[PDB]
Automatic annotation (TrEMBL), chain A:
InterPro entries: Ser_palmitoyltrfase_ssu-like (IPR024512). It comes from Arabidopsis thaliana. This is Transmembrane protein, putative (DUF3317). One of its GO terms (biological process) is regulation of sphingolipid biosynthetic process. The chain crosses the membrane at residues 26-44. Keywords: Endoplasmic reticulum, Membrane, Transmembrane, Transmembrane helix. It is a multi-pass membrane protein. The lineage of its organism: Eukaryota, Viridiplantae, Streptophyta, Embryophyta, Tracheophyta.
UniProtKB/TrEMBL annotation, chain C:
This is ORMDL family protein. The gene is ATORM1. Coiled coil: none annotated. The keyword Membrane applies. InterPro entries: ORMDL (IPR007203). One of its GO terms (cellular component) is serine palmitoyltransferase complex. It is found in: Membrane.
Length: 48, 471, 156, 27, 418
């Protein structure tokens, strides 16, 4: 395992995604990737 | 009592909320799927066992692992498969060879030694296993009358009675001593047998902070002054129940500071030497010898032969007229079947080894070897940054995890590298405190401990369970 | 990456259902879950903050009323069924009223209703709903409405 | 119609943040 | 409020009760210490005596083929279990025993318990909660009536073996709860009663429960391996499918010469008791050598169905000899192997009848070498059935020792009771 492959693994155990099933884990991962793009774009452009 | 890293105590509640929100969505989308048993009522409501199908079924391969060898330092683990969409694990051939770290033989008597097996086997071909009767009918053999004298010499007290179960030694004896109109100040963390034992009578139950005597006295004062709940009558009895070593906390009781408080308020003490009857003490005589406390200060003493002596059973020690009363009124002595003969012959011949009456000198090496291993293993984990509980001498050392998703991650990554451990979850322990239990015996060599340590250190880097600073 | 330790002391309780609420971090997570949801509804479906604070207040009333004032009993068979006729709210704090934890749970739906009204200029299509929530949610957390059922609904 | 509600709840909020915790009644 | 000095007196004027009551002179009598096993012909104080107090019905104590199977599993696993079943206390022999029992009885699944007497404390409280109804039998042994109290539910009793008093109770239960329909109802019985020696009629019990929608829990430890024509149990006796009985528990410390218990039944009820019991998830499992002998003992029962027909002959030969007794009267059944003998015409009081019975059981062994068992009730037992002496006849008893127990029991009651 390289560095990112270990940080992704550490992210899974701390937030409880290691236990969920293949769709449950993909339904929450996809909903967090959309909230990270709506903050970057908006937040760094709607203020400054 | 348990320092919790604040930031790790916020991601634990967020992980349990994700397992609850995703568990209530699959229940409402399954209640509508029952539109596509004969007149009776369901053996359980859907909302009853919610944490047995939405939490325990996700990690069921970390429990009930079958083995096909004696509970030794090394044993064989049977590999199972999921077959039908992960619902019924079925076992195969193709065992493994792991390093036993989740059993209980502290002194290493649960295997095959050159002094007990030969004697136990020779006494089973003369009495033949069980005797099919009670102890007041036909169940008192010569081996049952000689085993009640060995336990009286070991423990120290003037009399003793041995039973066939360690869990029925607390549900069938507390109702005899106290009833309706009495009080039981129990410690918070007591075994379920004690609790069920207090609920078997009409006695009221209270609870004082785990292992702090300054709260026991404040609980006793209120109860003695106040009286019985509704009708303010004075209690007729008070009994205080404590434990020698509190397992899953690895804590040795503050027995001298609990004896002196109960001795002033006229209460009775009830000791529970389940985990500390062959493990701690310079001669294996328990916590009354390690802490140096008079043995006549405690009224009743209960114990168990399952963990140190490698044989099922239990005992109660007390004064000579307490045993005479129990033998005549206890329900586990009048109705239950006597302890099997080869299970009682393995306690006599194990006690004769610890006391050094076997001719050899290998009874003190166990007691010496079990003190080093537990001290060297616990001192090597603290310097690596782990959070291990215990004092200095108890051979139980829980490692805190705090996250429900680190239970399978810690067990499955240790089994892959051939180390076997035990993990405990939320329905059992409190929501925030999940941990792993490590048992160190007197049969592990130093090389085995070194190998196990270099694996536990490597797996704690991935999961990041090194909550403290290293060195 | 680890600091700020707290030696959480163990209380009495003896009820696995409602004893987890005394440990440290239960308030900072109740507010973090309300903020995380707000941002999750403002991004998946582009809206205004006022229309996001109303959906976070309406969804929080359906998830709290069915958990705190509907389901009775405990999901653990360990205690047989001693509390077979007590809603989580009635089990909380062994019957004690107006405690430190009962004051925070009663002051969360009120403060979450003042933010969903002063960010939507009141109006009338949303002021009704946001007024039915608090009314029905605060009335149930009264010290007098203990073990009382309206017209014998869900009480035997 | 916008200040009579925010002005009243602050009064009600102070009322329960000062009450004394008491045991339930007896039989 | 009481001051912290007013409190200090109330803790000084308080004086507690003694831990135990004073020990009397009639509260101490040591039982016999026997040597060389415990079969039909045992040994006490040198002299050879006749055993009638051990509950081995099939005569498997000391069997040649049980010792060879205990030794092999005792030299391989050890004498201890080390740990619970939920951790690392699950050896393969434990799984093979549960597979063999269910194949013997013809049932999907099975479960093992460590102690024989503790298979009813965790089997009753685990099914009934604090809001259900139980209809017990008012003559059930302590083990069963302790699990009835552990499960905080509503217990209603009925007359001993009176199916007329069962219908009356069921009718009144199905009216006092006409509104509720969530309520779970259970009927708790016992195949061959220990305190009376009567055999339950499983013809009306499974016909009355199929009209009121109840559930049955049979505790058949005194019938499993002896009552049926093939040794299946009570079900075979009354010829009823073993599927109508929802739960079937038994103890293996009777006709199996081992220790432990089990609980047979469907798969949805067996696996639910695995993850939510009390004496299964909080106690050490069976030692492997004790569970490796039950497997051997079950095969002996299958391969030899004649040592059952030889048990009926023994009980019918000891029933025809005690048909003359004056002081007492056979109050048991006729096919059950627990010949009871309640004493006709109560001499003294409750504690006076239990002293005259224990003195007659002591003289029987101290004169002509006979071990018999008499009723022993504690203050926790809530049974009110008549007291008496019992004889656990076996299939290994001879014809000479079977007639030597009726002669010394008929001449010992005549010169005492009367
Ligand atoms: C996806 C992120 C969160 C999404 C929703 C998750 C929050 C739901 C928490 C519900 C709390 C349940 C309280 C009592 C429920 C009882 O009924 C049941 C059965 O009786 N007891 C039990 O299950 C035993 C108690 C243990 C339950 C563990 C759940 C606690 C996990 C989080 C606790 C602290 C975080 C939330 C505190 C309360 C939040 C209230 C819900 C917030 C509204 C969300 C809507 C945006
Ligand atoms: C206090 C106590 N009781 C009971 C048990 C378990 O009893 P058994 O001997 O049946 O395993 C343990 C372990 C214990 O620590």
């Amino acid at each position: 395992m390289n560095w990112v492959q270990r940080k992704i693994y550490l992210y899974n155990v701390t937030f409880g995604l290691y236990m969920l099933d293949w769709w449950e884990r993909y339904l929450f991962n996809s909903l967090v990737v959309v909230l990270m793009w709506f903050v970057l774009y908006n937040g760094t452009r709607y203020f400054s | 009592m348990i320092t919790i890293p604040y930031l790790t105590a916020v991601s634990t509640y967020f992980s349990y909320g994700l397992l609850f929100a995703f568990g209530q969505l699959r229940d409402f989308f399954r209640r509508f799927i029952d539109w596509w048993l004969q007149g009776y009522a369901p053996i359980c409501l859907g909302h009853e066992d919610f944490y047995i199908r939405r939490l325990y079924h996700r990690i069921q391969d970390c429990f009930e692992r079958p083995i096909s060898s004696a509970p030794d330092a090394w044993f064989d683990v049977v590999e199972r498969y999921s077959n039908d969409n992960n619902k019924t694990l079925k076992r195969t051939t193709k065992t493994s060879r792991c390093l036993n770290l989740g059993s209980y033989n502290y002194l290493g008597f649960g295997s095959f030694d050159e002094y007990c097996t030969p004697r136990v086997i020779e006494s089973l071909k003369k009495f033949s296993a069980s005797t099919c009767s009670s102890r007041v009918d036909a169940g008192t053999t010569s081996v049952h009358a000689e085993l009640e004298e060995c336990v009286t010499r070991f423990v120290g007290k003037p009399a003793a009675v041995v039973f066939g179960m360690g869990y029925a030694t607390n549900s069938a004896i507390i109702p005899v001593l106290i009833g309706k109109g009495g009080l039981i100040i129990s410690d918070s963390l007591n075994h379920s047998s004690i609790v069920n034992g207090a609920r078997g009578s009409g006695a009221t139950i209270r609870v004082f902070q785990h292992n702090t005597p300054s709260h026991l006295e404040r609980v006793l004062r209120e109860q003695i002054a106040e009286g019985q709940p509704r009708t303010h009558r004075p209690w007729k009895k008070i009994i205080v129940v404590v434990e020698g070593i509190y397992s899953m906390e690895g804590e040795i009781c503050h027995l001298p500071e609990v004896v002196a408080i109960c001795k002033k308020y006229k209460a009775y003490v009830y000791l529970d030497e389940a985990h500390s009857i062959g493990a701690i003490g310079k001669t294996g005589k328990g916590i009354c010898e390690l802490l140096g406390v008079d043995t006549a200060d405690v009224d009743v003493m209960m114990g168990t032969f399952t963990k140190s002596f490698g044989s099922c059973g239990g005992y109660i020690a007390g004064s000579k007229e307490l045993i005479q009363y129990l033998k005549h009124q206890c329900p586990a002595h009048l109705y239950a079947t006597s302890i099997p003969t080869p299970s009682a012959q393995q306690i006599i011949s194990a006690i004769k080894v610890i006391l050094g009456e076997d001719g050899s000198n290998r009874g003190a090496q166990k007691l010496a070897r079990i003190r080093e291993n537990s001290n060297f293993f616990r001192a090597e984990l603290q310097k690596m940054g782990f959070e291990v509980l215990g004092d200095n001498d108890s051979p139980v050392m829980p490692i805190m995890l705090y996250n429900p998703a680190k239970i399978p991650a810690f067990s499955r990554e240790c089994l892959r590298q051939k180390v076997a451990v035990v993990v405990v979850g939320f329905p059992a322990t409190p929501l925030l405190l999940a941990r792993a239990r490590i048992c160190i015996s007197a049969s592990h060599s130093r090389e085995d401990l070194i190998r196990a340590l270099k694996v536990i250190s490597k797996v704690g880097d991935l999961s990041g369970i090194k909550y403290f600073p290293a060195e | 990456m680890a600091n700020l330790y707290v030696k959480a002391v163990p209380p009495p309780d003896m009820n696995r259902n409602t004893e987890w609420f005394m440990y440290p971090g239960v308030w900072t997570t109740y507010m973090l879950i309300l903020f995380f949801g707000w941002l999750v509804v403002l991004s998946v479906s582009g809206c205004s903050p006022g229309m996001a604070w109303t959906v976070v207040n309406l969804a929080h009333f359906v998830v709290t009323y069915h958990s705190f004032h509907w389901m009775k009993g405990t999901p653990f068979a360990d205690d047989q069924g001693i509390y077979n006729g007590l809603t989580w709210w009635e089990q909380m704090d062994n019957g004690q009223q107006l405690t430190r934890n009962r004051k925070f749970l009663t002051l969360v739906p009120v403060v979450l209703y003042l933010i969903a009204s002063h960010t939507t200029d009141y109006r009338h299509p949303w002021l009704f709903l946001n007024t039915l929530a608090v009314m029905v949610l605060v009335v149930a957390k009264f010290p007098n409405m203990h073990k009382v059922r309206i017209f014998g609904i869900n009480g035997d | 119609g916008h200040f009579f509600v925010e002005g009243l709840l602050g009064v009600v909020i102070i009322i329960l943040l000062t009450r004394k915790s008491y045991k339930p009644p007896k039989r | 409020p009481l001051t912290e000095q007013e409190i200090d007196e109330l803790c000084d004027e308080w004086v507690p009760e003694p831990l135990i009551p004073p020990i009397t002179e009639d509260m101490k009598h040591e039982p016999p210490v026997l040597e060389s096993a415990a079969g039909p012909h045992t040994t006490v104080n040198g002299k050879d005596v006749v055993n009638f107090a051990s509950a081995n019905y099939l005569g498997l104590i000391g069997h040649e083929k049980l010792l060879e199977s205990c030794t092999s599993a005792l030299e391989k696993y050890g004498v201890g279990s080390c740990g619970p079943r939920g951790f690392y206390g699950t050896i393969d022999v434990h799984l093979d025993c549960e597979t063999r029992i269910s194949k013997f009885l013809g049932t999907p699944d099975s479960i093992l318990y460590s102690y024989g007497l503790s298979t009813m404390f965790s089997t009753i409280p685990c099914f009934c909660k604090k809001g259900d109804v139980i209809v017990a039998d008012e003559g059930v042994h302590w083990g069963i009536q302790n699990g009835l109290q552990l499960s905080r539910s509503t217990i209603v009793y009925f007359k001993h073996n009176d199916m007329e008093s069962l219908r009356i109770t069921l009718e009144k239960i199905m009216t006092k709860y006409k509104r509720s329909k969530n309520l779970r109802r259970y009927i708790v019985a016992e195949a061959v009663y220990q305190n009376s020696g009567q055999i339950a009629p499983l013809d009306e019990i499974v016909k009355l429960k199929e009209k009121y929608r109840f559930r049955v829990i049979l505790d058949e430890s005194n019938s499993f391996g002896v009552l049926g024509r093939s040794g299946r149990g009570l079900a075979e006796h009354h010829s009823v499918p073993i599927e109508k009985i929802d739960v079937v528990t038994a103890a293996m410390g009777h006709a199996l010469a081992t220790e432990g218990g089990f609980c047979t039944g469907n798969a949805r009820i067996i696996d639910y008791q695995r993850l939510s019991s009390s004496g299964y998830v909080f106690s050490a499992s069976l030692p492997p050598y004790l569970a490796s002998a039950a497997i051997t003992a079950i095969d002996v029962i299958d391969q030899n169905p004649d040592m059952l027909v030889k048990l009926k002959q023994n009980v019918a030969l000891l029933w025809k000899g005690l048909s003359d007794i004056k002081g007492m009267s056979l109050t048991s059944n006729r096919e059950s192997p627990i010949v009871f003998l309640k004493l006709e015409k109560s001499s003294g009081s409750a504690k006076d009848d239990l002293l005259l019975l224990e003195k007659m059981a002591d003289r029987a062994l101290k004169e002509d070498s006979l071990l018999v068992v008499s009723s022993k009730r504690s203050f926790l037992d809530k049974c009110r059935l008549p007291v008496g002496i019992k004889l656990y006849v076996s299939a290994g008893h001879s014809e000479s020792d079977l007639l030597k127990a009726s002669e010394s029991l008929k001449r010992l009651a005549s010169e005492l009771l009367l």
